[PDB]
Amino acid sequence: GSHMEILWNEAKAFIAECYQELGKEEEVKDRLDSIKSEIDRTGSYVHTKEELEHGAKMAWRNSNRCIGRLFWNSLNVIDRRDVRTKEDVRDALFHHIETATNNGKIRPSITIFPPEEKGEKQVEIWNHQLIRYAGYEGERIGDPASRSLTAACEQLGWRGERTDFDLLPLIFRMRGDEQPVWYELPRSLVIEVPITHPDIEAFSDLELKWYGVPIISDMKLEVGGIHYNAAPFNGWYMGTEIGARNLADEKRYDKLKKVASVIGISTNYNTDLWKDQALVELNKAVLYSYKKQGVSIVDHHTAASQFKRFEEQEEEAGRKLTGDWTWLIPPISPAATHIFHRSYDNSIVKPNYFYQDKPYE
Amino acid sequence: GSHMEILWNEAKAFIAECYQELGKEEEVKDRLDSIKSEIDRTGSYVHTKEELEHGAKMAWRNSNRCIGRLFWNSLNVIDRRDVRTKEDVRDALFHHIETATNNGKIRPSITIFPPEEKGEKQVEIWNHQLIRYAGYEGERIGDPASRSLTAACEQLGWRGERTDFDLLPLIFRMRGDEQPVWYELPRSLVIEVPITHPDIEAFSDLELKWYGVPIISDMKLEVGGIHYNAAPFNGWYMGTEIGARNLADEKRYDKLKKVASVIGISTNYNTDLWKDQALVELNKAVLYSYKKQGVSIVDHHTAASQFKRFEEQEEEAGRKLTGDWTWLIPPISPAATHIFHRSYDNSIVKPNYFYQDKPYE
Ligand code: HEM
Ligand code: HEM
Ligand SMILES: C[C@H](O)[C@H](O)[C@H]1CNC2=NC(N)=NC(=O)C2=N1
Ligand SMILES: C[C@H](O)[C@H](O)[C@H]1CNC2=NC(N)=NC(=O)C2=N1
Ligand SMILES: N=C(NO)NCCC[C@H](N)C(=O)O
Ligand SMILES: N=C(NO)NCCC[C@H](N)C(=O)O
Numbered sequence: 001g002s003h004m005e006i007l008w009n010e011a012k013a014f015i016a017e018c019y020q021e022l023g024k025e026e027e028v029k030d031r032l033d034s035i036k037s038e039i040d041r042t043g044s045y046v047h048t049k050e051e052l053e054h055g056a057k058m059a060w061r062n063s064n065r066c067i068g069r070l071f072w073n074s075l076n077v078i079d080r081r082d083v084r085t086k087e088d089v090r091d092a093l094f095h096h097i098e099t100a101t102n103n104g105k106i107r108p109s110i111t112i113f114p115p116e117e118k119g120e121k122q123v124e125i126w127n128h129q130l131i132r133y134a135g136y137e138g139e140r141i142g143d144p145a146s147r148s149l150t151a152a153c154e155q156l157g158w159r160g161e162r163t164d165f166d167l168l169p170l171i172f173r174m175r176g177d178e179q180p181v182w183y184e185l186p187r188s189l190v191i192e193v194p195i196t197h198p199d200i201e202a203f204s205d206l207e208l209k210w211y212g213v214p215i216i217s218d219m220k221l222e223v224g225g226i227h228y229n230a231a232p233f234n235g236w237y238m239g240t241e242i243g244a245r246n247l248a249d250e251k252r253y254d255k256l257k258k259v260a261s262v263i264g265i266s267t268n269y270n271t272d273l274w275k276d277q278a279l280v281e282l283n284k285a286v287l288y289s290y291k292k293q294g295v296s297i298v299d300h301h302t303a304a305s306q307f308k309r310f311e312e313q314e315e316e317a318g319r320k321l322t323g324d325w326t327w328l329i330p331p332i333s334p335a336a337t338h339i340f341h342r343s344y345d346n347s348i349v350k351p352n353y354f355y356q357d358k359p360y361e
Numbered sequence: 362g363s364h365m366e367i368l369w370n371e372a373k374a375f376i377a378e379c380y381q382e383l384g385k386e387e388e389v390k391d392r393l394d395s396i397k398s399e400i401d402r403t404g405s406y407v408h409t410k411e412e413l414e415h416g417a418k419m420a421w422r423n424s425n426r427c428i429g430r431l432f433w434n435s436l437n438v439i440d441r442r443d444v445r446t447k448e449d450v451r452d453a454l455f456h457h458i459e460t461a462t463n464n465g466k467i468r469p470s471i472t473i474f475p476p477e478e479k480g481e482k483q484v485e486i487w488n489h490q491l492i493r494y495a496g497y498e499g500e501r502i503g504d505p506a507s508r509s510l511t512a513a514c515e516q517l518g519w520r521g522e523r524t525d526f527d528l529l530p531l532i533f534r535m536r537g538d539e540q541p542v543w544y545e546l547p548r549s550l551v552i553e554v555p556i557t558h559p560d561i562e563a564f565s566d567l568e569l570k571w572y573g574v575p576i577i578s579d580m581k582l583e584v585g586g587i588h589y590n591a592a593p594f595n596g597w598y599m600g601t602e603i604g605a606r607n608l609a610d611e612k613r614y615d616k617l618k619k620v621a622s623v624i625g626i627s628t629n630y631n632t633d634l635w636k637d638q639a640l641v642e643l644n645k646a647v648l649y650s651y652k653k654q655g656v657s658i659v660d661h662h663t664a665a666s667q668f669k670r671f672e673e674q675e676e677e678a679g680r681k682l683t684g685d686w687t688w689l690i691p692p693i694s695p696a697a698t699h700i701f702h703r704s705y706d707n708s709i710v711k712p713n714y715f716y717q718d719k720p721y722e
Contacts, residue, residue, distance in 0.1 A: 027565070058533055144684045179473050244419065244696055245696060248696065248697070249696065249702075251702075256697070258448060262475065270660045270662035270663050270666075271648045271649070271652065271660050271663075272645065273641055273644055273645050273648070273660065273662075273694075275662060275694055275697045276640075276641045276644065276694045276697070277645075279637075279694055279697065280634055280638050280641050283634055283637065284634050284638075287469060287632045288632070299506075299631045299632050299634065301420060301633075301634075302631050305631075306703035325687060326687070331694075331696035331701070332637055332694065332696075333634075333636055333637045333640055333692075333693065334692060334695065335605055335606060335610065335692035335693075336609070336610065336617070336636045336637070336640065340692070341612075
């Protein structure tokens with residue numbers, strides 16, 4: 001009753017806006033009647049290959065927390081709404097990793113799976129990111145942020161080698177199944193980058209490494225009332241995400257003290273700013289390492305500069321700019337970027353990507 | 362009519378809360394009747410030396426943008442509500458600088474001047490901070506943030522030597538006067554710190570320096586409906602305010618490129634993170650310099666650690682904590698502090714310090 005009312009309302013708003021941007025104003029009338037009859041006949045409607053493709057781009061454009069939005073219209077949209085089996089999903093996910101990686105020259109992509117029908121999911125992806133390291137406890141091993149999912153995977157028959165960098169397997173559930181299935185990732189498909197420093201040879205003693213491509217797989221893509229709970233996407237890393245957060249946070253890998261040791265500085269006094277110096281050297285190491293192995297990565301200054309250009313384009317296009325200052329500012333030298341010196345409207349505009357409840361935990 | 366209604370309401374709320382904290386609950390009844398008759402007789406009321414003293418502390422405690430709130434109850438309250446002449450104000454301001462500086466061992470203080478009566482100010486301070494450098498244009502000279510006030514001072518007969526560090530004179534207006542008066546600051550009263558690096562000798566070639574004590578003099582102190590438009594206060598500097606903002610912002614002294622030059626690094630590539638390395642070395646220089654000259658200063662890690670202790674105390678006292686995340690996080694290595702990893706309620710609670718319109722511009 002009310003669900004068939006919200007759907008139609010969001011559909012009218014989307015088709016008008018989407019079609020307007022595609023230089024498509026006259027086809028709006030004939031497309032909305034087809035949609036009205038489809039919602040009455042079945043209870044939902046199916047997007048065309050052009051609608052969801054541009055819808056996915058519009059969603060990226062509206063992502064307040066993303067600094068890489070300048071590249072919104074270049075998104076590689078892979079249509080996999082035809083998957084029916086677990087093998088279809090597994091291969092589609094494998095394909096995503098492969099085509100997105102592109103031997104290092106990362107391609108911003110998104111794979112669209114079947115959306116929810118009567119509020120129930122067709123495909124449910126458990127992984128936060130397709131490629132991600134496991135986490136364990138006694139004393140900290142691996143990535144702490146992955147603990148709950150690791151435990152869930154282990155309750156399904158999977159077992160990790162308990163190193164600091166164990167690749168979590170792909171884990172997802174199909175409609176009709178009570179428990180999810182899992183598949184170990186083929187190593188030939190995952191690029192990993194060992195972290196080394198351009199001037200400091202001892203840096204390799206830390207034996208740090210990270211994976212080349214971040215593929216968020218647990219967010220819901222909302223386009224015109226249609227909920228794509230399963231639609232993995234990826235960009236390339238901004239150095240700061242790895243060297244200032246993933247490897248730096250006390251609740252993550254917490255490596256600043258060990259970094260200070262190999263670069264030769266004391267951790268005795270905050271006034272020496274050892275954490276700041278450690279952060280700079282660790283972050284320099286990350287950018288140098290990815291570049292050296294031929295894997296795309298961007299530094300926060302270049303990223304902010306690209307984002308400034310995005311702000312200008314949005315103003316030129318006539319569109320209102322939305323953003324979350326607290327996430328847009330880089331965790332290192334934020335005042336050195338223009339983002340810090342201005343304010344953003346944190347309003348939510350659809351289409352967009354949303355958080356959804358974790359099936360585990 | 363309505364003004365005599367807002368005043369009484371804010372007075373009841375303040376006396377109850379203030380007296381409650383002072384272990385003063387029974388004197389509330391007899392204090393509020395005196396205040397009610399005072400508002401009817403004159404149109405306002407006069408705080409006791411205990412009320413405004415604690416009121417000034419409570420205002421600091423409620424300052425969402427301040428990271429140094431752990432020290433709220435140690436504030437040195439100087440009562441100068443007895444000033445009538447421009448000389449009285451001048452000497453009180455001179456006294457503030459002297460006693461607050463305390464030969465380097467900075468004392469957090471605030472001088473209270475007569476508040477507003479029927480909405481009109483008794484004393485109006487034009488300076489943003491009592492001690493501050495001038496700014497000029499053709500090509501940038503001095504501090505750009507001081508340009509408008511410098512121009513106003515120059516329209517009153519004052520002339521600066523046009524160096525990058527010219528001390529602005531004290532400039533304030535008395536009730537009954539159309540234009541403000543000004544007084545050059547006695548150099549013997551102002552401590553300045555030349556910036557040098559502990560390991561890099563060439564750093565002195567930049568010839569940078571900053572003043573020892575930040576004394577905000579243009580904010581309005583609101584306590585129980587009483588508006589103290591003139592109530593200069595000071596703490597000690599957090600290194601980041603000088604080396605990451607005052608000397609780093611492109612719109613301020615913009616020294617990062619020159620810093621990179623003396624420390625021996627190239628400014629060619631963002632991927633080398635030269636701005637970040639320059640920031641670390643410039644900030645290390647600031648902390649080392651102040652410490653060397655015996656002037657109080659705190660690094661951002663120690664400051665955040667002290668602020669964490671403040672959060673705990675507020676929870677122990679039963680008080681709701683308020684804060685502005687965007688200002689609490691340091692401009693350098695914010696993710697290395699606990700502040701970055703949590704959220705704050707940016708609600709305004711009185712008493713507090715507020716912004717007021719600038720008489721110049
Ligand atoms: C092209 C390269 C890209 C860069 C450099 C980039 C960068 C960023 C960064 C730095 C963040 C903050 C991440 C964090 O702090 O955890 C972020 C968040 C986000 N980005 Fe991107 N991004 C890129 C591509 C994409 C694409 C392809 C999409 C969608 C189609 C997208 C959607 C989002 C969303 C929704 C968020 C919020 C994620 C969350 O809340 O965890 N981004 N991005
Ligand atoms: C004890 C040492 C103190 C430290 C370390 C400290 C530190 C800070 C810092 C770092 C800021 C941000 C400044 C900026 O970004 O421009 C700030 C803001 C502020 N502080 Fe303090 N503070 C201290 C004392 C005080 C005192 C004594 C008061 C009041 C009685 C106070 C009131 C405030 C207020 C109202 C703000 C906001 C100022 C504005 O909006 O420009 N602080 N403080
Ligand atoms: C509460 C606050 O919004 C969070 O701690 C933020 C702040 N900024 C952030 N920035 C980025 N890049 N990633 C985050 O997870 C993040 N989290
Ligand atoms: C719009 C935004 O609130 C301002 O640019 C902020 C952010 N954080 C800040 N932090 C500090 N310490 N001082 C500032 O002036 C400041 N300004
Ligand atoms: N830069 C991107 N996408 O392109 N980031 C997505 C989130 C990545 C996450 N912050 C991580 O470190 O794994
Ligand atoms: N730390 C304090 N007070 O104690 N700061 C007040 C504002 C100072 C200002 N940010 C400056 O650099 O001049």
